[PDB]
Design an enzyme around this catalytic site. Sequence first.
Site, PDB file in Angstrom:
ATOM      1  CG  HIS A  88       4.787  -0.354  -6.004  1.00 37.31           C
ATOM      2  ND1 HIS A  88       5.070  -1.689  -6.241  1.00 37.31           N
ATOM      3  CD2 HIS A  88       4.757  -0.192  -4.662  1.00 37.31           C
ATOM      4  CE1 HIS A  88       5.204  -2.307  -5.081  1.00 37.31           C
ATOM      5  NE2 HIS A  88       5.034  -1.413  -4.098  1.00 37.31           N
ATOM      6  NE  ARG A 110       5.096   4.591  -3.315  1.00 41.83           N
ATOM      7  CZ  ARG A 110       4.047   3.781  -3.174  1.00 41.83           C
ATOM      8  NH1 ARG A 110       3.541   3.561  -1.968  1.00 41.83           N
ATOM      9  NH2 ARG A 110       3.542   3.163  -4.225  1.00 41.83           N
ATOM     10  CG  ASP A 154      21.091  17.507  -3.975  1.00 40.36           C
ATOM     11  OD1 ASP A 154      20.883  18.576  -3.314  1.00 40.36           O
ATOM     12  OD2 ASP A 154      21.964  16.674  -3.661  1.00 40.36           O
ATOM     13  CD  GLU A 198       3.713   0.663   2.696  1.00 44.23           C
ATOM     14  OE1 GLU A 198       4.869   1.057   2.344  1.00 44.23           O
ATOM     15  OE2 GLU A 198       2.724   0.578   1.911  1.00 44.23           O
ATOM     16  CG  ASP A 215       2.845  -2.741   0.528  1.00 46.51           C
ATOM     17  OD1 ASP A 215       3.147  -3.891   0.194  1.00 46.51           O
ATOM     18  OD2 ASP A 215       3.310  -1.728  -0.033  1.00 46.51           O
TER      19      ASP A 215
HETATM   20  O1  LIG Z   1      -1.305   0.980  -0.848  1.00 53.23           O
HETATM   21  C1  LIG Z   1      -0.072   0.853  -0.765  1.00 53.23           C
HETATM   22  O2  LIG Z   1       0.426  -0.098  -0.175  1.00 53.23           O
HETATM   23  C2  LIG Z   1       0.804   1.749  -1.207  1.00 53.23           C
HETATM   24  O3  LIG Z   1       1.606   2.233  -0.413  1.00 53.23           O
HETATM   25  C3  LIG Z   1       0.960   2.011  -2.689  1.00 53.23           C
HETATM   26  C4  LIG Z   1      -0.080   1.566  -3.700  1.00 53.23           C
HETATM   27  O4  LIG Z   1       0.615   1.428  -4.953  1.00 53.23           O
HETATM   28  C5  LIG Z   1      -1.215   2.572  -3.859  1.00 53.23           C
HETATM   29  O5  LIG Z   1      -1.970   2.651  -2.643  1.00 53.23           O
HETATM   30  C6  LIG Z   1      -2.143   2.271  -5.024  1.00 53.23           C
HETATM   31  O6  LIG Z   1      -2.986   1.144  -4.778  1.00 53.23           O
HETATM   32 ZN   LIG Z   2       2.711   0.315  -0.126  1.00 57.57          ZN
END
Ligand SMILES: O=C(O)C(=O)C[C@H](O)[C@H](O)CO
Ligand SMILES: [Zn+2]
Lengths: 253, 253, 253, 253, 253, 253
Positions: free
Chosen positions: A47, A72, A86, A151, A177
């Site tokens: 993100h 991530r 790596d 999520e 999410d």
């Molecule tokens: O909250 C989520 O869905 C995440 O996996 C990433 C988000 O960018 C993070 O929680 C920040 O709000």
């Molecule tokens: Zn997320």
Amino acid sequence: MVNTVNYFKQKLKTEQQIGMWVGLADGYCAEIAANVGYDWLLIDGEHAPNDVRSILAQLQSIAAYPSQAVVRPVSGDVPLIKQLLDIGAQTLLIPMVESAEQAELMVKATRYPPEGIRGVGAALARASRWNNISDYLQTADEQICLLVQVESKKGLDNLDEILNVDGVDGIFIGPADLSAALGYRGNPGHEFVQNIIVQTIQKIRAAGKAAGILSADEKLAKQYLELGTEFVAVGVDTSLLMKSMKQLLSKFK
Amino acid sequence: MVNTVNYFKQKLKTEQQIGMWVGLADGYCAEIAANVGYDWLLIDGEHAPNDVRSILAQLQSIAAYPSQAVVRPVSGDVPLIKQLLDIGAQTLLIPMVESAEQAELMVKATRYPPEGIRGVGAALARASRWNNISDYLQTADEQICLLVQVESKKGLDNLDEILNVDGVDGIFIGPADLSAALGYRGNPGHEFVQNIIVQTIQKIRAAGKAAGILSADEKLAKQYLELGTEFVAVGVDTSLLMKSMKQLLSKFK
Amino acid sequence: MVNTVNYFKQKLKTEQQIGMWVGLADGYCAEIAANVGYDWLLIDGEHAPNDVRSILAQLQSIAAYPSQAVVRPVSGDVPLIKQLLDIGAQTLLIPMVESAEQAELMVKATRYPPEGIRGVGAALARASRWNNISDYLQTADEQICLLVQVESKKGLDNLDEILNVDGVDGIFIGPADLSAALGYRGNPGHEFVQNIIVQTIQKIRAAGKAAGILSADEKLAKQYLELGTEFVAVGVDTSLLMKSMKQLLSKFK
Amino acid sequence: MVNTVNYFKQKLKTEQQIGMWVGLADGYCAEIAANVGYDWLLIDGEHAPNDVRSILAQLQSIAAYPSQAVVRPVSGDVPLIKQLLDIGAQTLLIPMVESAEQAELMVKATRYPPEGIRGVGAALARASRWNNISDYLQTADEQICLLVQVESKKGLDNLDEILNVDGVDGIFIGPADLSAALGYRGNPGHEFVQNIIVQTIQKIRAAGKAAGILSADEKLAKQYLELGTEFVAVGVDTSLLMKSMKQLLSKFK
Amino acid sequence: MVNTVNYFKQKLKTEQQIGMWVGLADGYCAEIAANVGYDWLLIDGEHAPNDVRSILAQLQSIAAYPSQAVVRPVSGDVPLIKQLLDIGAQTLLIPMVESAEQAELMVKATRYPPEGIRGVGAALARASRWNNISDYLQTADEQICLLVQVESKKGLDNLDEILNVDGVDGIFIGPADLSAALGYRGNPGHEFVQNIIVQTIQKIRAAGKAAGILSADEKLAKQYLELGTEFVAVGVDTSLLMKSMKQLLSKFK
Amino acid sequence: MVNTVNYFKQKLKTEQQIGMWVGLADGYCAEIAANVGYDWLLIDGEHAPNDVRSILAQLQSIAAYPSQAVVRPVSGDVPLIKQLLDIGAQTLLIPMVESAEQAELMVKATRYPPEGIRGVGAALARASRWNNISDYLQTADEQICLLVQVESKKGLDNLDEILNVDGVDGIFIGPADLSAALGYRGNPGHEFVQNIIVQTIQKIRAAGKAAGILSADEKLAKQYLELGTEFVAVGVDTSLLMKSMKQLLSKFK
Ligand SMILES: O=C(O)C(=O)C[C@H](O)[C@H](O)CO
Ligand SMILES: [Zn+2]
Ligand SMILES: O=C(O)C(=O)C[C@H](O)[C@H](O)CO
Ligand SMILES: O=C(O)C(=O)C[C@H](O)[C@H](O)CO
Ligand SMILES: O=C(O)C(=O)C[C@H](O)[C@H](O)CO
Ligand SMILES: O=C(O)C(=O)C[C@H](O)[C@H](O)CO
Ligand SMILES: O=C(O)C(=O)C[C@H](O)[C@H](O)CO
Ligand SMILES: [Ca+2]
Ligand SMILES: [Ca+2]
Ligand SMILES: [Zn+2]
Ligand SMILES: [Zn+2]
Ligand SMILES: [Zn+2]
Ligand SMILES: [Zn+2]
Ligand SMILES: [Zn+2]
């Protein structure tokens, strides 16, 4: 040289680790975050506008500091996971894991053959310090930590099955999410969403896995820590930068 | 296209402009600052790790937003001033100006021949939008704003002479450099330093020039604004990022 | 390996070389220009947003093509000249040369001690291909070409003296800077300016030096070539890109 | 946080430090060098294609490793010295120092006012870790190490005068520049040059200053270490990379 | 702040929009294109050497100008579409769409849950201006424009089915890919290919979708505009740069 | 201009080509490797931190030198293969090929429609030099060389089937991945592994395909060359840099 010890991985069993999300996508900004004293820093390749090369720069910045780096990737892509391991990322957070089969594949993606499918290139890898860690190919697997995100509804529909996967060290709940998935987009604070999050944390810990979450809300973060949540991110660098500058301007308008 | 109007320059005579120091040295971080609503952003080429190319990236980010960009070069170097003007910086803050002779040379450095010594390269310059601003070579000089810093004893020893230079639009006081020069390094808050700063502001405005200053201290900043100081920077992005992350961690330790 | 032969330097005595100005400040854009077939490409470190590292990238792009690279530094700065020679620029165009003393110093800046003041670092230099050119420190000076710009009244006031400097291979007239200097800013086409340019070309060639100039005007460029001008730049990449895109849009408005 | 201790500076009085020259101008290559175990790494901003931003990336890479970073700026430029101290370079090697007056100015360039002329910007500086080193403005000067190069006849003509400058911690002999200055360009191994180098080392140590030198020749480097030379660079990354690849190809041709 | 209005999307129903392909893969070159006055600029992530970070730089350049940015990703990859939407690309052109099923998945890829599968990360996204657009998660979906390319026989074999997909705003015909698919590689001008293109445009507009195409041929482009084609790209920056430099050199050879 | 001739591809039938692995991921380091005289250079996009843009920079550096560039993508991803062909990579090494079906798809990924599925974008591609190679779309396919890696049990289980694929020019054996796959991770020198490698090389050459391998072991590399292996990589730049610096330090400790 001996392999870098993954203290984040060890501390999943011994303490509650406070985290900062790093989406400024810059080696210089990552070093500022590294000086604060967070237990872990999440370098967000999903993100924030990051790629392997910008993530490498941030790993190099953070490496001089005690804060543990977690990366991530944009998705559970086996070749991208190979690339991030790596450059020397020792803890990965895989977004949007939805089945035991996907979680098993993510386990294999982090382990060398013959047990896993991690591509072998120790002579080229910062991870092995270009073989200056002489026993890397024998000692690597033990310092790698795999975290998966639940999520989505399908994630929650397969929670028991994912929690039964050997090699998943932790399950992280993504409230943004998950609240969107549940039809409460932008409103994870709603009781319907919170009751599911609490039950999910309880089930993760009951199965002997580390539970993780992010909340920029101090009350929610402290509630999750009171439940025993093992890795809690408490803010986001982009958010804190914007808010600090807005709050300051508001004193002068 | 008509030349970009320098609103920062016009507002020196009509209002008090609130500023944010930008030292994160990054187009992405500069855009975050540009969204907040500061009257001006200082892109620091003296004390942040910036060069012409990173300053260009930050000008391009900020350009979509109402905040006016001011650029501080590493020194009053005529060729570097040429480079920063051609990438389209319309307001410059020159550090450590110490004589009328140096201030006059900085005026000339910002103006085309035959009156000045600014190198002519309009076909190549973002400043002219590569000659898409068709009358640029005639309209350029009017939208260029020259600010000089008084921040040494020699500066204070030549203040009246600098204030008499036609083409100096504003004198900015640097409290960090000035307090160090006065033997109070790290302690600009001391009465000895503050009495010199207040008298300096009074003299600047008495001579019909704009006065400017930076203080991260809300009380000092509001005091400077009560004196009529025309351009006041009230914080620094690196400072606010570090402080916001430390204050957050302290709630969880 | 033998030192890269400077064909630009040799051709100053044998033909008229057609040039393209390269201000897009990018290895990819420089390679596009390198494919066209210009005798020389001017990598502009004075009026395009370039630094040593971006100029190196453009030298690397252009090196696979027959076009000869010429680099303009931001000013006649001895240390910057050292840096541009070591990344392997074999022809330099020094802006705003105004005296025999300055021209002599630019000659020394391009030659190794004991005869010159060029800093020695052959083990680190692309110029020596990191000493893969085994005799570089003996063969370097001969393939270095020094060009100086006359583009101010003081330049014209010292023309005979600069033309008497051994080691100046060519004098380039900058019409933008010269027309501004003469009080005809943006209007080099005026007879007053053109008569001075023609007389200046005649005097340069009479003294046995190569004469150079830029004009995006086809008639003026062909006139300069008819006078025997040895190196003529006939366009600017930024200008051609902007004009080609505007001319195309105008067919559809 | 407490200021980073300059162990290079301390070790000038207690041991002989073995150095590697870093001219690959890259954060990734600098990290490979940092893993080897050299006492010091010279990030070359004079003879490799580096700028403040690429030097910062290499400081960040090296910072996680015990090797001490030394930075060579392109020249003894006071504003550039300011920029390199603020990104956190604690030891500087100034090229081509030729007088006590120049050495004194370099001492001042490294120290805060009121004693020196180092520009104050602790809120923006990696050097202060953006003021996370709370006492930086009081503790900075003690951990800064100034090295100057004697590598010209004028330097040798002013050696006793330079060695009498309080604040010069070390004098480094540049054999490439010095042999060229003496009319033995590319041939520092000549007895004429070596006798001058040995006498110069003896004079440096007799005045209580640290002596330094580079030689890729194992015999010369060991002879210099036998004379008590305090900081000896024994190779160059560009040279070792080129030679290792050439020697390998020669086994297969 | 209110969400950026997607004028490109609205103008699909009200006018014919003239486009420029941007493949110079550079924030500086993108800004030159942005000054010309095209209705839309195509930032090509498929056939120019772009990644998320270089595309972000180009969006930041273009954002100060009225030209609407459209981004082509390398393929219809759901995670990459997520990344491009979060850096603030409001219109996407998906290459090589070949079924209603693939077109439906691309619709979902651009919409938040629960209706779509766009990953939620508003705190980190330039798209939300890091939540400075306070209602972004409610207002985002409406200003997102999905364009899909029909440029294969399988695409043409599924045209009616793709045109029936709710959420596809426009179908763009790629003449290079389509002419190659039809066995006329490099020869889209052939009657066989043109008759298919015209019928395809007619069918697209008959189904109430916007039709689009690129031709560098002025006559073909004007023919497509006479048919009512809603978005017509009329050139390519790499092509115009190369052609303008070649045509200029040909006047001097 | 005529299409760049792929001499690597021609030499697969006429000689044994000696290779160097390039994992320093840098245009400057790639140029140092290009000066040595290797028959081929492997730009590693799988195990070094490269992306399309860093690979482009290394192709541009190498292009001025006789050494032939081979590019390894992170995986057999059709869209990534498209991107690497368009920046002008003429030889690709696909990792972890495990079936005739996958090898056939990689053949198609390298060829234009209608015979293949390579996306057409000649106006934007360095590969066509932006159409300055006028017949590129007709001459491209002939100068493209496809190499596939057999480095897993499933690859060995499908070797005869892969060797029967028209358009596979060469099979490269990856000893690191293969020894790990066989349960001898870090120990390819074992007789069990070596007997499989030798039989595999014999089978590749018996089917009329070029065989390839890497070994940093001089004895193994010479044994493979004695078997007639057509393309042998004999070292890795990261390894040689690290080892050369370690071996040098060990002389001084
Ligand atoms: O909250 C989520 O869905 C995440 O996996 C990433 C988000 O960018 C993070 O929680 C920040 O709000
Ligand atoms: Zn997320
Ligand atoms: O205060 C000064 O001396 C300045 O000129 C710049 C400083 O970096 C700024 O004020 C931040 O403290
Ligand atoms: O004309 C001059 O003054 C120059 O020296 C440089 C200009 O940028 C060039 O001629 C293009 O107009
Ligand atoms: O030797 C010198 O002159 C130096 O100062 C720097 C050189 O680059 C170094 O010694 C490597 O030869
Ligand atoms: O024409 C196509 O196939 C395209 O989709 C993209 C091309 O690069 C474009 O049209 C330029 O010719
Ligand atoms: O050996 C392999 O598996 C490879 O495919 C790549 C390796 O990085 C290479 O051989 C260097 O050990
Ligand atoms: Ca730079
Ligand atoms: Ca990148
Ligand atoms: Zn100051
Ligand atoms: Zn000029
Ligand atoms: Zn030297
Ligand atoms: Zn296409
Ligand atoms: Zn492999």
